[PDB]
Amino acid sequence: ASNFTQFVLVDNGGTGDVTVAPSNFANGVAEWISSNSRSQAYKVTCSVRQSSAQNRKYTIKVEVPKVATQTVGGVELPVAAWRSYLNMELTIPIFATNSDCELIVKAMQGLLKDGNPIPSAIAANSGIY
Amino acid sequence: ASNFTQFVLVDNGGTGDVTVAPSNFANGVAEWISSNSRSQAYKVTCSVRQSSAQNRKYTIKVEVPKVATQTVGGVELPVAAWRSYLNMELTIPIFATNSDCELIVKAMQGLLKDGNPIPSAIAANSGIY
Amino acid sequence: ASNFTQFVLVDNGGTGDVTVAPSNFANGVAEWISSNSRSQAYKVTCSVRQSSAQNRKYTIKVEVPKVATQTVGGVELPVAAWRSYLNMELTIPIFATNSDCELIVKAMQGLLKDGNPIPSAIAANSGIY
Amino acid sequence: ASNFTQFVLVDNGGTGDVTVAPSNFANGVAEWISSNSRSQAYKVTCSVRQSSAQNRKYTIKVEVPKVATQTVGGVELPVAAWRSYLNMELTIPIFATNSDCELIVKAMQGLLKDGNPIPSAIAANSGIY
Amino acid sequence: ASNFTQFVLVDNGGTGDVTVAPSNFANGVAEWISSNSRSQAYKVTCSVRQSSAQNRKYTIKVEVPKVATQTVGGVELPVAAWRSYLNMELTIPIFATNSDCELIVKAMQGLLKDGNPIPSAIAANSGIY
Amino acid sequence: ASNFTQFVLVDNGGTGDVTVAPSNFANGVAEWISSNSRSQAYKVTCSVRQSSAQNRKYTIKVEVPKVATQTVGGVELPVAAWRSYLNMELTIPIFATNSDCELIVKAMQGLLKDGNPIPSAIAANSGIY
RNA sequence: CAUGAGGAUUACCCAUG
RNA sequence: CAUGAGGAUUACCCAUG
RNA sequence: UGAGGAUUACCCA
RNA sequence: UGAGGAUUACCCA
């Protein structure tokens, strides 16, 4: 059994899909990277820790790159014009059961479901109105 | 037009669904709360700001309560045994187009899709392995 | 293959069986827990290290909880009345072959087999005499 | 109800079985050894004590000889190259009943049952993967 | 796309082939060993990390046992007289694409191809002349 | 004989093959380079030393360049965008016979053979999982 | 000299012993 | 690192070498 | 802790 | 900035 596996980060039907694969798991921090130039790759990291006596805390990070070609002195390198950074921390008391956790996950999926306020604002370069 | 509307945070088919409704939008911070006792309610907040010259930054927060009844001196009040806290920050350069933003959103939805590493770890009170 | 799989820790003839599953591998420590709130779960951890130039040491830990419901601040929480702890360290010389290691495993199984001295004493809350 | 008797430590089904018998009882520490020289013997020791006000603690030690290429009755140096050491400590809260203790024994048996992760890894000179 | 599987390390054409299989995955470092005692085994380990801002680095280690006059399963001292150690470090700039990386692998294969200088010198206990 | 000969480092079926030739042996370091300007050449170096009283250590280095044309001071020069570095050290005990050494060579060849774990990961810009 | 899943401008440098 | 029939709130702490 | 900033497992109050 | 903690739009380095 293992969940430190490869998975689809961005789904575009079946083609153009962005897949991220395991790359490193040093110091309790799991890392996934997409293939090809590390410089233009998507990155995902995850870790859990006992934040306090009663809490466990997940720290998740995602990096979405803007693929571009850099030319300098006639030398061109595959780079990322810029990157979008996602940073999330999830705190869960040790009294939470698997049921409570599944609920927390549905809340996160619901928060980002298509058509809902927040994902809509973000996708349109907007805020709330 | 308005996206500061009511929406389903937790989806349980059609029954038991947790709906969050607008409640306040003071100081550029939008807030949604579920119905009934504010003490046992789900909470969602969102805001955007120009974090720097080139970046805009979204700050989103979600609160999942563990509904319980508190009895003290024979007096019982509707409370939350504890709460799970979600805290996410999304940074997006001003060069991002609506297309770039839609991609960023799919990355977030993919990260949390059922069966993928992270949501699976969380739902099972686990880490990566 | 991959030996990091779930298994039955406490066998009660398929009914009320305490089964434990892979939950974390951060920092080279393999962890297994039962489907419970992290506060009431059975926990098993394992790690191997090359303790010396010519030795390998396995460190195994098992946590057996006495589940209970506690009323804190006039509120009920799933918790553990107390926990029992098993800490075992096994040092094997690098010269031991697979058959030598199989011999060690059999010794540990025979040691704890029903009816034998030690498990008998433990279960009866007594010493050896 | 004297339980300080000999038993089969390594079971090979009648043939090639290793029996271990009472050999010492100095200081309440019970000892069993196989019929070998003490340098090549199978040794088992066990004792119980009130570790603290809240706990009792069983200390179980096992010594297993490396058998491959072993010269029966010979002088094999260095000692650390020919022996494996098992060190078990079981902490049990004073509130544990015989029933509670029986379950703790089952947990130990389950941990080491044939085909499960830990014993499988040990028998294959492996770790968890 | 899990690539952590067993493979043939030493190929003698079906007969006398040395297979190496997954034996550990602690700390992201993958390990494979042959079916021997760890003192006489063939060991292979591999890990990747972002050595710096500009580079990624693969660390590959191999341990090969001295076989001539070897006593299978025996205790052979000193350890340094019976084992060879291979230590490989591969530094790859983040701009390298999969194509670039495929070429780097071909270079490594060419370096060690049968009949070429380096492998010929090593196999003959020689240097370059 | 004399093993200091040229050889094919990168094989592309006799067309676009990177062949490397003897270029220097100063200071006991055998060097090979490809037909290029010293700034864009593939480089291979090898040296053997009696690292200890009872050991011999081979130190091998390979440099794979990413050729490019750079405009410096408004002038075009053949150069390397970046370089990939392979550094390997092999320690062999003086007791290893020629057949023992042949075994080491085969292990290194099997390690990098197409389809096996490591070369697969490297070529796909990923780790082992 | 030794050890480092230490670094690089790559036959050099760093830390520890 | 090692040793403890050393302790625990249990991947931590203590003593000795 | 922070609708604190990032060259993003770093850094400031 | 922080795999920094929360009574969670607060607070610490």
Coordinates of C-alpha atoms in Angstrom, one line a residue, chain C:
Chain C
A1 CA 5.3 -6.4 -3.6
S2 CA 5.6 -3.8 -0.8
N3 CA 5.2 -5.0 2.7
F4 CA 3.7 -1.7 3.9
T5 CA 0.2 -3.2 4.1
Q6 CA -2.7 -3.2 6.6
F7 CA -3.1 -6.2 8.9
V8 CA -5.1 -7.6 11.8
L9 CA -3.4 -6.6 15.0
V10 CA -6.1 -8.1 17.4
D11 CA -7.8 -11.2 16.1
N12 CA -11.3 -11.9 17.4
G13 CA -12.5 -14.3 14.8
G14 CA -13.5 -11.7 12.1
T15 CA -15.9 -9.9 14.6
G16 CA -14.6 -7.0 16.6
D17 CA -11.2 -7.5 15.0
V18 CA -8.8 -4.6 15.5
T19 CA -7.3 -4.1 12.0
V20 CA -4.5 -1.5 11.5
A21 CA -3.5 0.3 8.3
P22 CA -0.6 2.3 6.9
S23 CA -0.9 5.9 7.9
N24 CA 2.5 7.5 7.7
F25 CA 6.1 6.9 6.6
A26 CA 7.6 10.4 7.4
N27 CA 11.2 10.3 8.7
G28 CA 11.8 6.7 8.0
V29 CA 9.2 5.6 10.6
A30 CA 6.5 3.4 9.2
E31 CA 3.2 4.0 11.1
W32 CA -0.1 2.1 11.2
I33 CA -3.3 3.1 13.0
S34 CA -6.8 1.8 13.4
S35 CA -9.9 3.5 12.1
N36 CA -10.4 5.8 15.0
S37 CA -9.9 9.3 16.1
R38 CA -6.2 9.9 16.5
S39 CA -6.9 10.1 20.2
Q40 CA -8.4 6.6 20.5
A41 CA -6.4 4.7 17.9
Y42 CA -4.2 1.7 18.2
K43 CA -0.8 2.7 16.9
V44 CA 2.1 0.6 15.5
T45 CA 5.4 2.0 14.4
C46 CA 8.5 0.4 13.0
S47 CA 12.0 1.6 11.9
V48 CA 15.3 0.0 10.9
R49 CA 18.7 1.5 11.4
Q50 CA 22.3 0.4 10.9
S51 CA 23.0 1.0 14.6
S52 CA 26.7 0.0 14.2
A53 CA 29.2 -0.9 11.5
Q54 CA 28.2 -4.5 12.0
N55 CA 24.6 -4.3 13.3
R56 CA 21.1 -3.5 12.2
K57 CA 18.5 -2.6 14.8
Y58 CA 14.7 -2.8 14.4
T59 CA 12.7 -0.5 16.7
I60 CA 9.0 -1.5 17.1
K61 CA 6.3 0.2 19.2
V62 CA 2.7 -0.7 19.8
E63 CA 0.1 1.3 21.7
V64 CA -3.0 -0.4 23.0
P65 CA -5.7 2.0 24.2
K66 CA -8.5 1.7 26.7
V67 CA -11.2 3.8 24.9
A68 CA -13.6 6.0 26.9
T69 CA -15.8 9.1 26.6
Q70 CA -14.8 12.0 28.7
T71 CA -16.9 15.1 29.6
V72 CA -14.6 18.1 29.5
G73 CA -16.0 21.6 29.9
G74 CA -19.4 20.0 30.0
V75 CA -18.7 18.4 26.6
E76 CA -18.2 14.8 25.5
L77 CA -15.0 13.8 23.7
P78 CA -13.7 10.4 22.4
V79 CA -10.5 9.7 24.4
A80 CA -8.3 7.1 26.0
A81 CA -8.6 6.3 29.7
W82 CA -5.1 5.0 29.5
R83 CA -2.7 3.3 27.1
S84 CA -0.5 0.2 27.3
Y85 CA 2.9 0.5 25.7
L86 CA 5.1 -2.2 24.0
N87 CA 8.6 -1.2 23.1
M88 CA 10.9 -3.7 21.4
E89 CA 14.4 -3.4 20.0
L90 CA 15.9 -6.2 17.9
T91 CA 19.6 -6.2 17.1
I92 CA 20.7 -8.5 14.3
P93 CA 24.3 -8.9 13.1
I94 CA 24.9 -8.1 9.4
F95 CA 26.2 -11.7 9.0
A96 CA 22.7 -13.2 9.7
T97 CA 21.3 -14.9 6.5
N98 CA 17.6 -15.0 5.7
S99 CA 17.3 -18.4 7.3
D100 CA 19.0 -17.0 10.4
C101 CA 16.4 -14.2 10.5
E102 CA 13.5 -16.6 10.0
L103 CA 14.8 -18.3 13.1
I104 CA 14.5 -15.1 15.1
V105 CA 10.9 -14.6 13.9
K106 CA 9.9 -18.1 14.9
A107 CA 11.5 -17.6 18.3
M108 CA 9.4 -14.5 18.9
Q109 CA 6.2 -16.3 17.8
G110 CA 6.9 -19.3 20.0
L111 CA 7.6 -16.9 22.9
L112 CA 4.1 -15.4 22.7
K113 CA 2.1 -18.5 21.8
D114 CA -1.0 -19.2 23.8
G115 CA -0.3 -21.5 26.8
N116 CA 3.3 -20.7 27.0
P117 CA 4.8 -19.2 30.2
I118 CA 5.1 -15.5 29.4
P119 CA 1.8 -14.8 27.7
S120 CA 0.2 -16.8 30.5
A121 CA 1.7 -14.6 33.2
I122 CA 0.9 -11.4 31.5
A123 CA -2.7 -12.3 30.9
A124 CA -3.2 -13.4 34.6
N125 CA -1.6 -10.2 36.0
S126 CA 1.2 -12.2 37.6
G127 CA 4.9 -12.9 37.5
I128 CA 6.7 -16.1 36.7
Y129 CA 6.9 -18.7 39.4

